[PDB]
mmCIF file of C-alpha atoms and ligand atoms in Angstrom:
data_model
loop_
_atom_site.group_PDB
_atom_site.id
_atom_site.type_symbol
_atom_site.label_atom_id
_atom_site.label_comp_id
_atom_site.label_asym_id
_atom_site.label_seq_id
_atom_site.Cartn_x
_atom_site.Cartn_y
_atom_site.Cartn_z
ATOM 1 C CA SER A 14 -4.939 -12.378 -20.031
ATOM 2 C CA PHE A 15 -2.493 -10.142 -18.200
ATOM 3 C CA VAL A 16 -2.443 -7.699 -21.051
ATOM 4 C CA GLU A 17 -6.114 -7.157 -20.513
ATOM 5 C CA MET A 18 -5.430 -6.277 -16.842
ATOM 6 C CA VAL A 19 -2.711 -3.750 -17.481
ATOM 7 C CA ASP A 20 -3.691 -0.195 -16.444
ATOM 8 C CA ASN A 21 -6.742 -1.367 -14.481
ATOM 9 C CA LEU A 22 -5.978 0.956 -11.627
ATOM 10 C CA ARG A 23 -6.696 4.610 -11.112
ATOM 11 C CA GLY A 24 -6.111 7.016 -8.245
ATOM 12 C CA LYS A 25 -3.405 8.490 -6.053
ATOM 13 C CA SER A 26 -0.942 7.691 -3.311
ATOM 14 C CA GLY A 27 -2.779 10.174 -1.063
ATOM 15 C CA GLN A 28 -6.334 8.964 -1.703
ATOM 16 C CA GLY A 29 -5.394 5.433 -2.733
ATOM 17 C CA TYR A 30 -5.629 3.294 -5.831
ATOM 18 C CA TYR A 31 -8.805 1.678 -6.947
ATOM 19 C CA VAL A 32 -10.026 -1.026 -9.379
ATOM 20 C CA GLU A 33 -13.435 -1.427 -10.938
ATOM 21 C CA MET A 34 -15.455 -4.341 -9.568
ATOM 22 C CA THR A 35 -19.023 -5.533 -9.763
ATOM 23 C CA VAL A 36 -21.238 -6.876 -7.081
ATOM 24 C CA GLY A 37 -24.619 -8.613 -7.369
ATOM 25 C CA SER A 38 -26.937 -9.885 -10.101
ATOM 26 C CA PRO A 39 -27.335 -8.055 -12.380
ATOM 27 C CA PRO A 40 -23.878 -6.630 -11.821
ATOM 28 C CA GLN A 41 -23.551 -3.266 -10.017
ATOM 29 C CA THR A 42 -20.349 -1.469 -10.948
ATOM 30 C CA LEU A 43 -18.334 0.179 -8.135
ATOM 31 C CA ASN A 44 -14.788 1.462 -7.793
ATOM 32 C CA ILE A 45 -12.890 -0.242 -4.983
ATOM 33 C CA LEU A 46 -9.767 0.752 -3.092
ATOM 34 C CA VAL A 47 -7.067 -1.887 -3.311
ATOM 35 C CA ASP A 48 -5.711 -2.345 0.227
ATOM 36 C CA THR A 49 -2.985 -4.939 1.052
ATOM 37 C CA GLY A 50 -3.148 -3.590 4.662
ATOM 38 C CA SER A 51 -6.538 -5.084 5.619
ATOM 39 C CA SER A 52 -8.628 -8.169 4.871
ATOM 40 C CA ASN A 53 -12.303 -7.062 4.639
ATOM 41 C CA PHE A 54 -14.213 -6.503 1.403
ATOM 42 C CA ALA A 55 -16.673 -3.702 2.145
ATOM 43 C CA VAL A 56 -18.761 -1.411 0.016
ATOM 44 C CA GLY A 57 -20.952 1.638 0.647
ATOM 45 C CA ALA A 58 -24.518 0.267 0.805
ATOM 46 C CA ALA A 59 -26.377 3.384 1.844
ATOM 47 C CA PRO A 60 -26.446 7.034 0.695
ATOM 48 C CA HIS A 61 -23.511 9.221 1.804
ATOM 49 C CA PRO A 62 -22.508 12.769 0.751
ATOM 50 C CA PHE A 63 -19.171 11.492 -0.570
ATOM 51 C CA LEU A 64 -20.498 8.477 -2.413
ATOM 52 C CA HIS A 65 -21.213 8.745 -6.149
ATOM 53 C CA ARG A 66 -23.131 5.488 -5.941
ATOM 54 C CA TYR A 67 -23.655 2.500 -3.660
ATOM 55 C CA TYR A 68 -24.474 -1.237 -3.459
ATOM 56 C CA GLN A 69 -28.221 -1.730 -3.562
ATOM 57 C CA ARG A 70 -28.798 -5.198 -2.072
ATOM 58 C CA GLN A 71 -32.516 -5.130 -2.844
ATOM 59 C CA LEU A 72 -31.705 -5.069 -6.579
ATOM 60 C CA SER A 73 -29.547 -8.136 -6.393
ATOM 61 C CA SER A 74 -31.238 -11.500 -6.696
ATOM 62 C CA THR A 75 -28.113 -13.362 -5.682
ATOM 63 C CA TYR A 76 -27.566 -11.537 -2.379
ATOM 64 C CA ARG A 77 -27.660 -13.646 0.810
ATOM 65 C CA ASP A 78 -28.005 -11.941 4.221
ATOM 66 C CA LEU A 79 -25.818 -13.417 6.878
ATOM 67 C CA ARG A 80 -27.789 -11.640 9.552
ATOM 68 C CA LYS A 81 -24.573 -10.626 11.312
ATOM 69 C CA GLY A 82 -22.948 -7.224 11.792
ATOM 70 C CA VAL A 83 -19.330 -6.035 11.511
ATOM 71 C CA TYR A 84 -17.300 -3.058 12.751
ATOM 72 C CA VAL A 85 -13.923 -2.104 11.326
ATOM 73 C CA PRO A 86 -11.677 0.591 12.840
ATOM 74 C CA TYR A 87 -8.544 1.462 10.821
ATOM 75 C CA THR A 88 -5.738 3.753 12.032
ATOM 76 C CA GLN A 89 -7.858 6.537 10.686
ATOM 77 C CA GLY A 90 -11.506 6.081 9.695
ATOM 78 C CA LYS A 91 -14.031 3.407 10.518
ATOM 79 C CA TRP A 92 -17.264 1.819 9.284
ATOM 80 C CA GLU A 93 -20.084 -0.354 10.447
ATOM 81 C CA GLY A 94 -22.018 -2.772 8.231
ATOM 82 C CA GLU A 95 -24.107 -5.839 7.652
ATOM 83 C CA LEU A 96 -22.480 -9.023 6.420
ATOM 84 C CA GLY A 97 -23.750 -11.035 3.458
ATOM 85 C CA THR A 98 -22.546 -12.794 0.398
ATOM 86 C CA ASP A 99 -23.066 -12.098 -3.280
ATOM 87 C CA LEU A 100 -21.466 -12.585 -6.699
ATOM 88 C CA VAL A 101 -18.369 -10.470 -7.389
ATOM 89 C CA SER A 102 -16.328 -9.855 -10.502
ATOM 90 C CA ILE A 103 -13.397 -7.708 -11.688
ATOM 91 C CA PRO A 104 -14.207 -6.548 -15.249
ATOM 92 C CA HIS A 105 -10.527 -5.816 -16.081
ATOM 93 C CA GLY A 106 -9.242 -8.606 -13.970
ATOM 94 C CA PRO A 107 -9.432 -12.390 -14.229
ATOM 95 C CA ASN A 108 -12.284 -13.800 -16.362
ATOM 96 C CA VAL A 109 -14.265 -15.203 -13.460
ATOM 97 C CA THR A 110 -17.121 -14.495 -11.088
ATOM 98 C CA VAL A 111 -17.064 -15.750 -7.457
ATOM 99 C CA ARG A 112 -19.256 -15.642 -4.413
ATOM 100 C CA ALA A 113 -17.647 -13.633 -1.646
ATOM 101 C CA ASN A 114 -18.309 -12.098 1.692
ATOM 102 C CA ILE A 115 -19.340 -8.516 1.489
ATOM 103 C CA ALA A 116 -19.704 -6.010 4.290
ATOM 104 C CA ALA A 117 -22.473 -3.632 3.339
ATOM 105 C CA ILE A 118 -21.537 -0.326 4.958
ATOM 106 C CA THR A 119 -24.541 1.320 6.638
ATOM 107 C CA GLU A 120 -22.698 3.833 8.837
ATOM 108 C CA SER A 121 -19.243 5.399 8.594
ATOM 109 C CA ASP A 122 -17.001 8.015 10.099
ATOM 110 C CA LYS A 123 -14.111 9.615 8.124
ATOM 111 C CA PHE A 124 -13.849 6.498 5.954
ATOM 112 C CA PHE A 125 -15.175 7.811 2.612
ATOM 113 C CA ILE A 126 -13.174 10.704 1.179
ATOM 114 C CA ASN A 127 -14.728 13.554 -0.764
ATOM 115 C CA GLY A 128 -13.691 13.252 -4.405
ATOM 116 C CA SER A 129 -11.779 9.998 -4.215
ATOM 117 C CA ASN A 130 -13.986 8.241 -6.796
ATOM 118 C CA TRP A 131 -14.128 4.948 -4.845
ATOM 119 C CA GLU A 132 -17.096 3.405 -3.007
ATOM 120 C CA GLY A 133 -15.536 0.467 -1.135
ATOM 121 C CA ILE A 134 -12.393 -1.252 -0.041
ATOM 122 C CA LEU A 135 -10.814 -4.602 -1.091
ATOM 123 C CA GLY A 136 -8.727 -5.955 1.768
ATOM 124 C CA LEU A 137 -6.131 -8.311 0.182
ATOM 125 C CA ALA A 138 -4.369 -9.394 3.351
ATOM 126 C CA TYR A 139 -4.964 -12.623 5.373
ATOM 127 C CA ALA A 140 -7.827 -13.876 7.403
ATOM 128 C CA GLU A 141 -5.988 -13.426 10.672
ATOM 129 C CA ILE A 142 -6.780 -9.726 10.648
ATOM 130 C CA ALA A 143 -10.252 -9.961 9.183
ATOM 131 C CA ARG A 144 -13.184 -8.564 11.282
ATOM 132 C CA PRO A 145 -15.118 -9.697 13.230
ATOM 133 C CA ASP A 146 -12.563 -12.539 13.244
ATOM 134 C CA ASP A 147 -10.528 -14.866 11.096
ATOM 135 C CA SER A 148 -13.569 -17.040 10.319
ATOM 136 C CA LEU A 149 -14.699 -14.462 7.700
ATOM 137 C CA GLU A 150 -13.017 -15.577 4.524
ATOM 138 C CA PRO A 151 -11.314 -12.716 2.629
ATOM 139 C CA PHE A 152 -12.028 -12.088 -1.066
ATOM 140 C CA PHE A 153 -8.731 -13.365 -2.470
ATOM 141 C CA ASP A 154 -9.039 -16.588 -0.531
ATOM 142 C CA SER A 155 -12.511 -17.090 -1.933
ATOM 143 C CA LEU A 156 -11.271 -16.228 -5.421
ATOM 144 C CA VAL A 157 -8.541 -18.896 -5.211
ATOM 145 C CA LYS A 158 -10.717 -21.587 -3.684
ATOM 146 C CA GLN A 159 -13.532 -21.231 -6.312
ATOM 147 C CA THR A 160 -11.393 -20.704 -9.494
ATOM 148 C CA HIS A 161 -8.195 -22.065 -10.848
ATOM 149 C CA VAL A 162 -6.429 -18.698 -10.467
ATOM 150 C CA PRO A 163 -2.897 -19.086 -9.094
ATOM 151 C CA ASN A 164 -2.438 -17.896 -5.508
ATOM 152 C CA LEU A 165 -0.635 -14.577 -6.119
ATOM 153 C CA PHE A 166 -1.171 -11.035 -7.373
ATOM 154 C CA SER A 167 1.038 -8.124 -8.245
ATOM 155 C CA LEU A 168 0.671 -4.342 -7.950
ATOM 156 C CA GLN A 169 2.301 -1.745 -10.128
ATOM 157 C CA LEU A 170 1.400 1.594 -8.580
ATOM 158 C CA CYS A 171 2.338 4.652 -10.538
ATOM 159 C CA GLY A 172 2.523 8.328 -9.490
ATOM 160 C CA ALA A 173 1.738 11.316 -11.585
ATOM 161 C CA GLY A 187 -2.738 4.924 -12.130
ATOM 162 C CA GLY A 188 -1.271 1.428 -12.411
ATOM 163 C CA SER A 189 -1.945 -2.243 -12.712
ATOM 164 C CA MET A 190 -3.156 -5.068 -10.490
ATOM 165 C CA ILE A 191 -2.338 -8.365 -12.087
ATOM 166 C CA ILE A 192 -4.097 -11.364 -10.561
ATOM 167 C CA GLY A 193 -2.848 -14.846 -11.048
ATOM 168 C CA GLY A 194 0.702 -14.320 -12.249
ATOM 169 C CA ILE A 195 3.695 -12.088 -13.016
ATOM 170 C CA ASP A 196 3.651 -9.789 -16.055
ATOM 171 C CA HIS A 197 7.241 -9.440 -17.115
ATOM 172 C CA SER A 198 6.248 -6.448 -19.326
ATOM 173 C CA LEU A 199 5.712 -4.437 -16.176
ATOM 174 C CA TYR A 200 9.240 -4.564 -14.860
ATOM 175 C CA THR A 201 12.908 -4.517 -15.874
ATOM 176 C CA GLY A 202 15.950 -6.018 -14.247
ATOM 177 C CA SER A 203 15.832 -8.578 -11.425
ATOM 178 C CA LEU A 204 12.887 -9.434 -9.215
ATOM 179 C CA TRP A 205 14.134 -9.763 -5.638
ATOM 180 C CA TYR A 206 12.099 -11.620 -2.943
ATOM 181 C CA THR A 207 11.701 -11.110 0.791
ATOM 182 C CA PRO A 208 9.948 -13.728 2.950
ATOM 183 C CA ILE A 209 6.510 -13.041 4.395
ATOM 184 C CA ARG A 210 7.359 -13.380 8.082
ATOM 185 C CA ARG A 211 3.773 -14.166 9.186
ATOM 186 C CA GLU A 212 0.568 -14.335 7.148
ATOM 187 C CA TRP A 213 -1.654 -11.674 8.699
ATOM 188 C CA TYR A 214 -0.574 -8.407 7.317
ATOM 189 C CA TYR A 215 1.972 -8.750 4.609
ATOM 190 C CA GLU A 216 4.740 -8.636 7.221
ATOM 191 C CA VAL A 217 8.345 -8.354 6.147
ATOM 192 C CA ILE A 218 11.642 -7.755 7.767
ATOM 193 C CA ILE A 219 13.945 -4.701 7.227
ATOM 194 C CA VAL A 220 17.549 -5.602 8.030
ATOM 195 C CA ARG A 221 19.341 -2.293 7.336
ATOM 196 C CA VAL A 222 18.503 1.300 6.618
ATOM 197 C CA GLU A 223 20.643 3.875 4.893
ATOM 198 C CA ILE A 224 19.978 7.576 4.174
ATOM 199 C CA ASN A 225 22.206 8.816 1.378
ATOM 200 C CA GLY A 226 24.504 5.866 1.721
ATOM 201 C CA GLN A 227 24.902 6.320 5.479
ATOM 202 C CA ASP A 228 23.917 3.491 7.795
ATOM 203 C CA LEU A 229 21.619 4.490 10.556
ATOM 204 C CA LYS A 230 23.420 1.858 12.668
ATOM 205 C CA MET A 231 20.573 0.738 14.847
ATOM 206 C CA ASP A 232 19.884 -2.758 16.120
ATOM 207 C CA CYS A 233 17.896 -4.004 13.242
ATOM 208 C CA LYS A 234 15.010 -5.049 15.440
ATOM 209 C CA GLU A 235 14.326 -1.356 15.841
ATOM 210 C CA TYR A 236 13.421 -1.102 12.159
ATOM 211 C CA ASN A 237 10.682 -3.718 12.696
ATOM 212 C CA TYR A 238 9.537 -2.557 16.091
ATOM 213 C CA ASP A 239 6.034 -4.069 16.441
ATOM 214 C CA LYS A 240 6.183 -5.144 12.833
ATOM 215 C CA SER A 241 6.914 -3.976 9.334
ATOM 216 C CA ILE A 242 4.250 -4.325 6.609
ATOM 217 C CA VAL A 243 3.573 -3.544 2.961
ATOM 218 C CA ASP A 244 0.375 -1.530 2.837
ATOM 219 C CA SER A 245 -1.123 -0.198 -0.357
ATOM 220 C CA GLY A 246 -3.920 1.406 1.571
ATOM 221 C CA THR A 247 -1.540 3.801 3.413
ATOM 222 C CA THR A 248 -0.074 6.763 1.677
ATOM 223 C CA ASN A 249 3.150 7.425 3.583
ATOM 224 C CA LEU A 250 6.287 5.672 4.590
ATOM 225 C CA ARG A 251 5.623 5.286 8.367
ATOM 226 C CA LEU A 252 8.493 4.608 10.719
ATOM 227 C CA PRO A 253 8.847 3.788 14.448
ATOM 228 C CA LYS A 254 9.727 6.848 16.535
ATOM 229 C CA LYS A 255 13.417 6.123 16.935
ATOM 230 C CA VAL A 256 13.852 5.388 13.216
ATOM 231 C CA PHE A 257 11.685 8.376 12.201
ATOM 232 C CA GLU A 258 13.753 10.795 14.213
ATOM 233 C CA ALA A 259 17.039 9.501 12.732
ATOM 234 C CA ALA A 260 15.513 9.804 9.234
ATOM 235 C CA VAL A 261 14.325 13.373 9.712
ATOM 236 C CA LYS A 262 17.681 14.333 11.223
ATOM 237 C CA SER A 263 19.467 13.025 8.127
ATOM 238 C CA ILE A 264 17.043 14.605 5.621
ATOM 239 C CA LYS A 265 17.097 17.920 7.436
ATOM 240 C CA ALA A 266 20.882 18.026 7.515
ATOM 241 C CA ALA A 267 21.068 17.236 3.791
ATOM 242 C CA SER A 268 18.514 19.890 2.748
ATOM 243 C CA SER A 269 19.887 22.578 5.138
ATOM 244 C CA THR A 270 20.492 25.037 2.325
ATOM 245 C CA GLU A 271 16.702 25.346 2.046
ATOM 246 C CA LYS A 272 14.328 26.796 4.575
ATOM 247 C CA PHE A 273 11.185 24.847 5.350
ATOM 248 C CA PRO A 274 7.858 26.067 6.788
ATOM 249 C CA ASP A 275 6.769 25.448 10.418
ATOM 250 C CA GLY A 276 5.369 21.906 10.611
ATOM 251 C CA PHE A 277 6.694 20.615 7.340
ATOM 252 C CA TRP A 278 8.393 17.610 9.030
ATOM 253 C CA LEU A 279 5.104 16.681 10.645
ATOM 254 C CA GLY A 280 3.707 16.049 7.136
ATOM 255 C CA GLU A 281 0.721 18.346 7.031
ATOM 256 C CA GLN A 282 2.267 21.581 5.741
ATOM 257 C CA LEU A 283 3.034 22.348 2.075
ATOM 258 C CA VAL A 284 6.365 23.435 0.696
ATOM 259 C CA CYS A 285 6.291 24.909 -2.798
ATOM 260 C CA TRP A 286 8.833 25.832 -5.484
ATOM 261 C CA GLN A 287 8.647 27.682 -8.812
ATOM 262 C CA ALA A 288 7.302 25.347 -11.543
ATOM 263 C CA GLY A 289 10.025 22.880 -12.479
ATOM 264 C CA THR A 290 12.582 24.134 -10.013
ATOM 265 C CA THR A 291 12.158 21.639 -7.183
ATOM 266 C CA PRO A 292 15.644 21.092 -5.656
ATOM 267 C CA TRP A 293 15.512 17.254 -5.825
ATOM 268 C CA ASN A 294 19.298 17.032 -5.428
ATOM 269 C CA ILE A 295 19.461 18.424 -1.884
ATOM 270 C CA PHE A 296 17.261 15.622 -0.587
ATOM 271 C CA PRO A 297 18.836 12.266 0.103
ATOM 272 C CA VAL A 298 17.882 8.812 -1.149
ATOM 273 C CA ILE A 299 16.605 6.279 1.376
ATOM 274 C CA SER A 300 17.621 2.660 1.101
ATOM 275 C CA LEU A 301 15.589 -0.056 2.877
ATOM 276 C CA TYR A 302 17.387 -3.410 2.934
ATOM 277 C CA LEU A 303 14.927 -6.272 3.100
ATOM 278 C CA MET A 304 15.640 -9.782 4.312
ATOM 279 C CA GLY A 305 16.518 -12.140 1.472
ATOM 280 C CA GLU A 306 15.510 -15.726 0.875
ATOM 281 C CA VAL A 307 18.996 -16.980 1.717
ATOM 282 C CA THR A 308 20.413 -16.657 5.229
ATOM 283 C CA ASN A 309 21.975 -13.185 5.907
ATOM 284 C CA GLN A 310 21.602 -12.074 2.315
ATOM 285 C CA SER A 311 19.460 -9.064 1.555
ATOM 286 C CA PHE A 312 18.541 -6.646 -1.255
ATOM 287 C CA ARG A 313 17.749 -2.977 -1.133
ATOM 288 C CA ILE A 314 15.103 -0.836 -2.606
ATOM 289 C CA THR A 315 16.068 2.802 -3.003
ATOM 290 C CA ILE A 316 13.587 5.606 -2.476
ATOM 291 C CA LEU A 317 14.051 9.045 -4.025
ATOM 292 C CA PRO A 318 12.620 12.368 -2.910
ATOM 293 C CA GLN A 319 10.339 12.211 -5.912
ATOM 294 C CA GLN A 320 8.651 9.449 -3.893
ATOM 295 C CA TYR A 321 8.778 10.743 -0.306
ATOM 296 C CA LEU A 322 7.872 14.285 -1.236
ATOM 297 C CA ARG A 323 4.288 13.766 -2.319
ATOM 298 C CA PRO A 324 2.949 16.294 -4.902
ATOM 299 C CA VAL A 325 -0.325 17.819 -3.764
ATOM 300 C CA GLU A 326 -2.452 18.680 -6.753
ATOM 301 C CA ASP A 327 -4.659 21.692 -6.099
ATOM 302 C CA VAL A 328 -5.728 24.010 -8.886
ATOM 303 C CA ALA A 329 -5.485 26.901 -6.434
ATOM 304 C CA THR A 330 -1.780 26.302 -5.848
ATOM 305 C CA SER A 331 -0.987 25.261 -9.407
ATOM 306 C CA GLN A 332 1.168 28.216 -10.339
ATOM 307 C CA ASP A 333 3.821 26.338 -8.399
ATOM 308 C CA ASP A 334 4.773 22.802 -7.550
ATOM 309 C CA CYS A 335 3.883 21.985 -3.925
ATOM 310 C CA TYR A 336 4.569 18.919 -1.802
ATOM 311 C CA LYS A 337 3.979 17.347 1.564
ATOM 312 C CA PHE A 338 6.576 15.340 3.488
ATOM 313 C CA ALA A 339 5.331 11.772 3.080
ATOM 314 C CA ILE A 340 7.264 10.234 5.913
ATOM 315 C CA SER A 341 5.465 9.992 9.242
ATOM 316 C CA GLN A 342 6.033 8.696 12.809
ATOM 317 C CA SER A 343 4.209 5.441 13.422
ATOM 318 C CA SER A 344 2.806 3.820 16.568
ATOM 319 C CA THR A 345 1.963 0.640 14.699
ATOM 320 C CA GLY A 346 5.380 -0.313 13.343
ATOM 321 C CA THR A 347 6.900 0.335 9.921
ATOM 322 C CA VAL A 348 4.498 0.780 7.062
ATOM 323 C CA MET A 349 5.782 0.663 3.509
ATOM 324 C CA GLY A 350 2.869 2.558 2.049
ATOM 325 C CA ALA A 351 1.937 3.710 -1.471
ATOM 326 C CA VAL A 352 4.779 6.239 -1.925
ATOM 327 C CA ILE A 353 7.175 3.441 -1.297
ATOM 328 C CA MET A 354 5.448 0.934 -3.622
ATOM 329 C CA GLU A 355 5.202 3.525 -6.398
ATOM 330 C CA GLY A 356 7.559 2.934 -9.183
ATOM 331 C CA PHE A 357 8.172 -0.707 -8.208
ATOM 332 C CA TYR A 358 6.506 -3.788 -9.463
ATOM 333 C CA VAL A 359 5.524 -5.671 -6.243
ATOM 334 C CA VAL A 360 4.596 -9.289 -6.308
ATOM 335 C CA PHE A 361 2.493 -10.710 -3.523
ATOM 336 C CA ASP A 362 3.477 -14.324 -3.956
ATOM 337 C CA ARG A 363 1.142 -15.915 -1.411
ATOM 338 C CA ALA A 364 1.719 -19.427 -2.784
ATOM 339 C CA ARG A 365 5.470 -19.201 -1.881
ATOM 340 C CA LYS A 366 5.007 -16.844 1.159
ATOM 341 C CA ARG A 367 7.236 -14.086 -0.299
ATOM 342 C CA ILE A 368 7.053 -10.559 -1.670
ATOM 343 C CA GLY A 369 8.966 -9.625 -4.794
ATOM 344 C CA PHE A 370 10.255 -6.179 -5.832
ATOM 345 C CA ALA A 371 11.547 -5.040 -9.129
ATOM 346 C CA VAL A 372 11.886 -1.681 -10.974
ATOM 347 C CA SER A 373 8.721 -0.899 -12.959
ATOM 348 C CA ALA A 374 8.269 1.109 -16.140
ATOM 349 C CA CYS A 375 6.949 4.018 -14.096
ATOM 350 C CA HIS A 376 9.778 4.140 -11.531
ATOM 351 C CA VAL A 377 10.905 7.558 -10.471
ATOM 352 C CA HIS A 378 14.239 9.061 -11.649
ATOM 353 C CA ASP A 379 15.916 12.172 -12.842
ATOM 354 C CA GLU A 380 19.147 12.678 -14.824
ATOM 355 C CA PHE A 381 21.374 11.886 -11.824
ATOM 356 C CA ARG A 382 19.512 9.341 -9.673
ATOM 357 C CA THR A 383 16.965 6.575 -10.017
ATOM 358 C CA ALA A 384 14.857 4.227 -7.860
ATOM 359 C CA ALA A 385 16.478 0.817 -7.810
ATOM 360 C CA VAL A 386 16.203 -2.717 -6.506
ATOM 361 C CA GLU A 387 19.735 -4.084 -5.958
ATOM 362 C CA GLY A 388 21.291 -7.182 -4.446
ATOM 363 C CA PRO A 389 22.590 -9.366 -3.001
ATOM 364 C CA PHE A 390 24.167 -7.844 0.068
ATOM 365 C CA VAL A 391 25.695 -9.951 2.819
ATOM 366 C CA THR A 392 25.682 -9.246 6.565
ATOM 367 C CA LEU A 393 28.063 -10.748 9.113
ATOM 368 C CA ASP A 394 25.907 -10.431 12.252
ATOM 369 C CA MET A 395 23.552 -13.366 12.517
ATOM 370 C CA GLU A 396 20.912 -11.607 14.555
ATOM 371 C CA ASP A 397 17.220 -12.242 13.732
ATOM 372 C CA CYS A 398 15.888 -8.768 12.853
ATOM 373 C CA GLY A 399 12.283 -9.753 13.660
ATOM 374 C CA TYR A 400 10.852 -8.129 16.685
ATOM 375 C CA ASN A 401 8.616 -11.052 17.586
HETATM 376 C C1 0GS B 1 -7.496 -4.749 11.540
HETATM 377 C C2 0GS B 1 -7.361 -3.920 10.217
HETATM 378 F F1 0GS B 1 -8.572 -3.438 9.908
HETATM 379 F F2 0GS B 1 -7.000 -4.675 9.250
HETATM 380 C C3 0GS B 1 -6.389 -2.720 10.440
HETATM 381 C C4 0GS B 1 -6.473 -1.769 11.538
HETATM 382 C C5 0GS B 1 -5.563 -0.743 11.711
HETATM 383 C C6 0GS B 1 -4.522 -0.584 10.812
HETATM 384 C C7 0GS B 1 -4.340 -1.465 9.679
HETATM 385 C C8 0GS B 1 -3.222 -1.298 8.704
HETATM 386 N N1 0GS B 1 -3.729 -0.900 7.368
HETATM 387 C C9 0GS B 1 -4.541 0.396 7.240
HETATM 388 C C10 0GS B 1 -3.631 1.608 7.494
HETATM 389 S S1 0GS B 1 -4.666 3.133 7.447
HETATM 390 O O1 0GS B 1 -3.773 4.300 7.443
HETATM 391 O O2 0GS B 1 -5.609 3.069 8.486
HETATM 392 C C11 0GS B 1 -5.420 2.948 5.821
HETATM 393 C C12 0GS B 1 -6.283 1.685 5.817
HETATM 394 C C13 0GS B 1 -7.230 1.651 4.510
HETATM 395 C C14 0GS B 1 -7.983 2.967 4.354
HETATM 396 C C15 0GS B 1 -9.024 3.390 5.299
HETATM 397 C C16 0GS B 1 -9.644 4.588 5.115
HETATM 398 F F3 0GS B 1 -10.656 4.954 6.011
HETATM 399 C C17 0GS B 1 -9.379 5.447 4.066
HETATM 400 N N2 0GS B 1 -10.050 6.601 3.930
HETATM 401 C C18 0GS B 1 -8.356 5.069 3.122
HETATM 402 BR BR1 0GS B 1 -7.831 6.110 1.644
HETATM 403 C C19 0GS B 1 -7.675 3.820 3.280
HETATM 404 C C20 0GS B 1 -5.381 0.397 5.918
HETATM 405 O O3 0GS B 1 -6.106 -0.795 5.975
HETATM 406 C C21 0GS B 1 -5.307 -2.515 9.557
#
């Protein structure tokens, strides 16, 4: 039941969101990062300073060794492992157990994070981007093939963890309309941005620029990441809007804190960002609106806790647009694989203050008939 799956996520935008899973027989419990930006299921399978626990294959009587290796480099971080299959379940997910491919991680570099509380990663994207290649069936594909569970899941990520609902839409997790954008190609969850506004002002670029290389929805990435040209325009607009405030050297590069007296963060001087996504009907679109409460990521540190401190959670990308966790937060996002579309609605934990709120609004119509896809 969906009600049983509500609030089955913990974690952060910055260090990711994780769900409890089990692997092996008898079941070994692990926390697993939920990642719509990759397609491998991999778990720590050897001791590591940052691992609280790990998959012990010798204690699983249902483990099968595939006698093959696998290497996965992400944008940051990488791991190497041995492939096998074993029985996998999600205690606070669907009431099923399936046999799935598992990469047992034996070596890693800057993959595991100190204090994150997860021990593996669940890549929920498509086989096309699986390593070593597309012949390695991803977990969700195995889940759908071996059970009767409908081919879709939804994510409700919440900031200061959320819910992953597998097999259907939980109407209790959103208000207002659910708006759908097509999945352009089934590899990453690739979508098309047709228009960008910052505080109501159109950036006025050829819309292909917004999707340069590609645009994807990626729960495993913290920031909104933008192609260079779009990033520079965004920073220009946000800097102009917040000009009454002085920001530290390096703030706009995303690795320097800015702090304000507790409760006094000047939210109002930062603009809202609107991303218009391609609709299901020709030249119609809808927008999701992003508040500074989203793109200024709070950095919890007891040492700095006399004040409220933030990092700028928009970054320049070399890999195309990435709608990461800070974008997904506050929205109910439906990965409707069966109908090749992604839905957005306002969730119960959407960000807002007394003047402004995150929103999903449509339809909007565009005159120009250009295809905004880059490829
Ligand atoms: C082919 C591939 F593996 F799917 C691939 C390769 C490069 C980029 C992408 C896009 N998705 C990536 C973006 S990322 O910033 O590297 C985070 C990564 C998951 C991840 C890896 C990590 F280490 C750590 N700590 C954390 Br937290 C989270 C996503 O998965 C996918």
